[PDB]
Amino acid sequence: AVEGMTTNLMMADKEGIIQYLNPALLQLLTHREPELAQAFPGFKAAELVGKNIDIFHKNPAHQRSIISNPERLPFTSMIKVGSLEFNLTCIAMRDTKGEYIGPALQLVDIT
Ligand code: HEM
Numbered sequence: 207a208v209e210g211m212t213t214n215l216m217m218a219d220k221e222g223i224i225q226y227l228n229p230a231l232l233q234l235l236t237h238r239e240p241e242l243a244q245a246f247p248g249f250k251a252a253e254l255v256g257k258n259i260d261i262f263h264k265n266p267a268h269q270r271s272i273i274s275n276p277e278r279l280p281f282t283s284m285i286k287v288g289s290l291e292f293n294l295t296c297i298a299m300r301d302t303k304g305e306y307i308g309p310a311l312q313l314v315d316i317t
Pocket residue numbers: 216217218224246254259262263264265268269272273281282283284285286287288294296309310311
């Protein structure tokens with residue numbers, strides 16, 4: 207629904223370790239755990255922080271090349287996550303001195 211359009215955000219460090227999920231995304235992934243557990247059997251949304259993103263990517267070096275090269279960010283794509291569908295945006299996070307920290311992901315639900 208349009209009432210359900212919100213800001214879904216997930217952050218990782220340069221080594222691909224998930225650092226933070228915002229509440230809207232945590233709520234969505236909890237709601238969608240039926241679909242997510244079919245695509246990713248042991249999936250628990252509250253358990254994602256500290257995990258490496260490589261676990262969830264079928265060709266992990268592809269996403270690694272995207273988040274390792276902040277000069278080529280921002281990156282946008284449409285992705286299928288099990289039976290879910292998202293419009294994905296990946297942007298570079300930087301510290302106060304301008305250094306790249308890792309990727310931030312925004313997902314727009316188009317399931
Ligand atoms: C901040 C953490 C994450 C980053 C930086 C990240 C990075 C990316 C990027 C850039 C894409 C687009 C690839 C493309 O369209 O060519 C992508 C797609 C995808 N991501 Fe993630 N992702 C993250 C978290 C997750 C999580 C938690 C899951 C599983 C729940 C996941 C599973 C997928 C899947 C299934 C796709 C589409 C199919 C694939 O390329 O493997 N990602 N990810």
